[PDB]
Structures are given as C-alpha cells and as structure tokens.
C-alpha cells in the first residue's frame, strides 16, 4: 500500500551530503518485488533477515536515498570507514536494516559530465550516526583563520562527481537506499502480508 515508488523509481535522487529521508508507517509492504526484483546490484541486510522481513512488525521505517560512486557502495555498512562513511552518511554500530544499491549509469550520466551530484570530503570531526550536514562553511586546515575566503589551507568542503558514460563500472553512479526500522513503545504499524 505504501509508496515504494517515491523512493526507488523516482525522477531525480539527492546527493549523498544531503540524503533524502522518507518516513513510512501504516503499510503492508510486499517485499517479493524487492528481494526478488532481479534488478539490484546489492541487497545487504543486517540485524534482519530478507526471508523474514515480512515477519517482524515495526513502528516506523525510514528510507534514506542518495547516489554514490560505485566503489563506495561497500562503505554503506555498519562499522565502516572511508571518505563517504564518516563525512557524508554513516550507519550506526547496532544497525538493523537493509542497504539496496543498483547501477544508474543510464539515468544519472551525461556526455558533458553530470555535475549536479556532490559529496563532502572535509569535516572537523566525524559524523555521529544518522546525521546530515549541509553547511558550506570553508574548512579550516592551517592555524591561520580565514573568514570565508578560499585559498591555501582553506578549502570548499564539497566536490562533484565526474559521471560520464565511458567511465568504468567502479566509477559509475549507483543509487543507494537504506531502510532502517524503528520499534518503540508506540504500537507496531508496518509489516507485510501475514
């Protein structure tokens, strides 16, 4: 019933540094069209079982969608480190959810190089689990402060992906959706066929 059409086959995905979060509740989700979709590159699931996703009922399910480079798909997993696993989007140590990634080389790629996707490569400290940073303040590297002026020892903390059709498989864009489950005192609301 709930719309897994606004999350998976949507028009335009968001960048990794601003990952789109959608809350879903009061649903009966049919996961035979997801687990056995035969179209997804990675369908990893931690803390839960893909064969038992329809068994346990939860209060809320959060779907976080973004686009990352192909070789960085492995970084979306609990207890990972890397340029995108601590500065853009992190998963909690005790994570119970699923990570679903599929290649998007036929949509998010242009002959001149799509420049509308960004990732952050600088931060004063790592990210706490499930934290979104949008600030474009200039990162400080040296001891001499710089008041909003770029230069040596002062950089812009965002870069764009050089997506092109001729790129390799590892550098091709990949759409990643993370489904996380919340079960608190409020009665459980979402689970599939009984």
């Amino acid at each position: 019933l709930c719309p897994f059409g606004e999350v998976f086959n949507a028009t335009r995905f968001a960048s990794v540094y601003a990952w789109n979060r959608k809350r879903i509740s009061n649903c009966v989700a049919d996961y035979s069209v997801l687990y056995n979709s035969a179209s997804f590159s990675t369908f990893k699931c931690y803390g839960v079982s893909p064969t038992k996703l329809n068994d346990l009922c939860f209060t809320n399910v959060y779907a976080d969608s973004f686009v990352i480079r192909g070789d960085e798909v492995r970084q979306i997993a609990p207890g990972q480190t890397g340029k995108i696993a601590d500065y853009n989007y992190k998963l909690p140590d005790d994570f119970t959810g699923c990570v679903i990634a599929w290649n998007s080389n036929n949509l998010d790629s242009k002959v001149g190089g799509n420049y509308n996707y960004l990732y952050r490569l600088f931060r004063k400290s790592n990210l706490k689990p499930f934290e979104r940073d949008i600030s474009t303040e200039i990162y400080q590297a040296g001891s001499t402060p710089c008041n909003g002026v770029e230069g040596f020892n002062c950089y812009f903390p965002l870069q764009s992906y050089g997506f092109q059709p001729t790129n390799g498989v590892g550098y091709q864009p990949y759409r990643v959706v993370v489904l996380s489950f919340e079960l608190l005192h409020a009665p459980a609301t979402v689970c599939g066929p009984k």
Partner: antibody, heavy 123, light 112 residues
Framework: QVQLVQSGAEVKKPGASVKVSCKAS????????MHWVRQAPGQGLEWMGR????????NYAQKFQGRVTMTRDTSISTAYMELSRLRSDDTAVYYC???????????????????WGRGTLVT | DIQMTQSPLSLPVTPGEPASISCRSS????????????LDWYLQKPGQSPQLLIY???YRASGVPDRFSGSGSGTDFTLKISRVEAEDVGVYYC?????????FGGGTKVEI
C-alpha cells in the same frame, strides 16, 4: 582531444570591457580549479585570478580586484572572465590554465598548471 | 607578495653541455607543515603556450624528457639541463605558490 577551447581575438576600445571564455573538452570540468594568466607583449606572465567550479568562489590579485569578474557554467562546462575599464596596457594574450582540485590529503601540493589553453589576444 | 628574481636573463647554450638557471625568492618557499618547497618551472616556446616542466622543486611533469632536473634549497633554486637539446630553446619561468598573489619570475631566455 583533451583540450581547452578559448574565444577568438577581440578588439576593444579603451574604457570598454572584454569577455574571454574557456571551454573544457575531454575531462571533468569540476575536478580542476580554473586560473587566468595573461602575458603582455615583451613582459612576463601575470596571474589574474582563479575560480572554483564547485562553489563559484573566486580569488583575484589585488591589482585586478574590482574589475575582473569570473563566472562558471557547468551545464556547458565553460569559465568566463570579464575585465572592465580596459586600458592600453591590457593588450595581451590571456591563457586559461587548469589546476588539480585535490589530489592528496593536503590539496595544496598538486596545484600546478598541468594544462594551458591556446590563448586569446585582447587589444 | 613574493617577488622572484631569476639570474641568467640571457642564457646562450651549446648542445651537449649542462645549463643552470638560478631563481631567488624574497621569502623562503619551504613550508614547515609538510616539508615541501613550492616552486614550479615552466617553459614557453615561441608562439606556444607555457608547458609544465618541474613541480614541487624536485618532480618532473608528465611527458617531460629525462634531460631536465631541478633542485635547490631555502630561497636559491636551480633548474639544470644536463644535455641541452635543440628543442630546449625558449623562456623559463619560476613560479611560487605559497601566498596567493601567485607570482611568476621575470623569465630566462635560452637560445642557441
């Protein structure tokens, strides 16, 4: 075929303004800072300024501040440099150079001019 | 604002003999944080755009033939051509990249 295409020669009267375009071909435009360096006839190279394609923030020299405006267009991957209040001393060849954005953990050690355009003559 | 003064301002050379070009800076280009000296040697041929030869005071650029080398310390820097070839004629520029008014030297002309 990895190249930087520049605008043709421009003749401008004193007191007017000149716009020079540098278009990237064969590489990712947003992976490189774009610098503008001019060479007057009989003089050495002079550095004008730089633009970051990602943010649009620009750093100019003190001499050219208040006259030079640098803009970027990612849809066509072109950097434009516009100089206002032209004089007789601005008659020069303007080259656009590319600089690796960040190739290390310092992003300060890779900042060389690894590619130069063919230049545009402004009179 | 760092000003680079390049010594030979006219370096007549004969092929087969090494040639040395001196460049001097008002302020030391060594950075204590990373231990790197930021001086780049560029070559401009007649009618052609400048090309990169040396970066970070010790490294050769891609496509640079082995006959070139660069060294120096503090403020005194030297570009050395062990074997000068017929195509080394041009103008050589030393550029600093520590403060932002990126400044290129006066240039040294090497012609046969």
């Amino acid at each position: 075929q990895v190249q930087l295409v520049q605008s043709g020669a421009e003749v401008k009267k004193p007191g007017a303004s000149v716009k020079v375009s540098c278009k990237a071909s064969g590489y990712t435009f947003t992976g490189y800072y774009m610098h503008w360096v001019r060479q007057a006839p009989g003089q050495g190279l002079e550095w004008m300024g730089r633009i970051n394609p990602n943010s649009g923030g620009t750093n100019y020299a003190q001499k050219f501040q208040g006259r030079v405006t640098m803009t970027r267009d990612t849809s066509i991957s072109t950097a434009y440099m516009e100089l206002s209040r032209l004089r007789s001393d601005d008659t020069a060849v303007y080259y656009c150079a590319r600089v690796p954005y960040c190739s290390s953990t310092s992003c300060h050690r890779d900042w060389y001019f690894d590619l130069w355009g063919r230049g545009t003559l402004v009179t | 604002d760092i000003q680079m003064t390049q010594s030979p301002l006219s370096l007549p050379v004969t092929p087969g003999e090494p040639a040395s070009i001196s460049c001097r800076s008002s302020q030391s280009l060594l950075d204590s944080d990373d231990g790197n000296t930021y001086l780049d040697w560029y070559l401009q041929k007649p009618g052609q755009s400048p090309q990169l030869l040396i970066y970070t005071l010790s490294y050769r650029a891609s496509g640079v033939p082995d006959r070139f080398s660069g060294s120096g310390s503090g403020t005194d820097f030297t570009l050395k051509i062990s074997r000068v070839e017929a195509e080394d004629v041009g103008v050589y520029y030393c550029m600093q990249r520590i403060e932002f008014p990126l400044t290129f030297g006066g240039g040294t002309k090497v012609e046969i």
